[PDB]
Each structure stands twice: as C-alpha cells, then as structure tokens.
Amino acid sequence: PALTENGGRVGFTRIQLIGSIKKFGFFYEWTQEAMDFDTDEELDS
Amino acid sequence: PALTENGGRRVGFTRIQLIGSIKKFGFFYEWTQEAMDFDTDEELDS
C-alpha cells in the first residue's frame, strides 16, 4: 500500500466449522437356567 | 407340560350352567248340600 501526499479512498473473513454427534450401543441376553446350572458362580461378574 | 429353558408360550377354564323349573300343581272336589244333610255319617266333611 503506497499512499501519496493526498489520501482519499481491504477485507476480513471468517470460516465456519461443523461437527456432529452420533449414537452407538449394544446389549446382550441370558437366561436363569444358564446362570443356575453353570459350573462357575461369578459368571455374571 | 414342558417348560424349556427358553419359555414364552397355555390353559383355560370353563363353567357350566344348571337350570331348574317351577311347575304348578293342584286339584279340587265338589259336594252338594244334600250330600251333607242326608248322609249316613255326620263327620263326612271332616
């Protein structure tokens, strides 16, 4: 920018960042008989 | 019955109806005056 003896007649910008959230999971089943007649006690643990 | 270790699926119950009835019954008899006055017995009415 070279300004002369006289004056007389830049920019700025911003950017946008986008994120997302997702869902996850899992689950399992068991029966009483499986726990009841099983050799190991802390199988639940 | 046979409950497998899975389970999931039964019995029912019923009742029956009894009906009676009321039936009318009766009879009657008649007599004349002369029957009472001119009878050999005087206690026929009784």
Whole-angstrom distance, CA of residue B6 vs CA of residue A33: 9
Whole-angstrom distance, CA of residue A30 vs CA of residue A44: 10
State which approach was used to obtain the coordinates: cryo-EM
Whole-angstrom distance, CA of residue A17 vs CA of residue A2: 36
Whole-angstrom distance, CA of residue A19 vs CA of residue B13: 62
Query: Between A and B, how many residue pairs show a Cβ–Cβ distance under 8 A?
Result: 4
CB of A31 less than 8 A from some CB of B: yes
Nearest by Cα to B34 from B44, B25, B26: B44
Specify the resolution in Å. Answer: 3.3
Give DSSP secondary structure letters for chain A: ----SS-------------------------HHHHHT-S-STT--
Enter the DSSP assignment of B17.
Answer: -
CB of B46 less than 8 A from some CB of A: no
Phi (first) and psi of residue B35, to 5 degrees: -60, -45
CB of B6 less than 8 A from some CB of A: yes
Q: Which chain B residue has the Cα nearest residue A33?
A: B5
CA distances from B36 to B17, B29, B39 (A): 54, 14, 6
Contacts of A36 in chain B (CB under 8 A): none
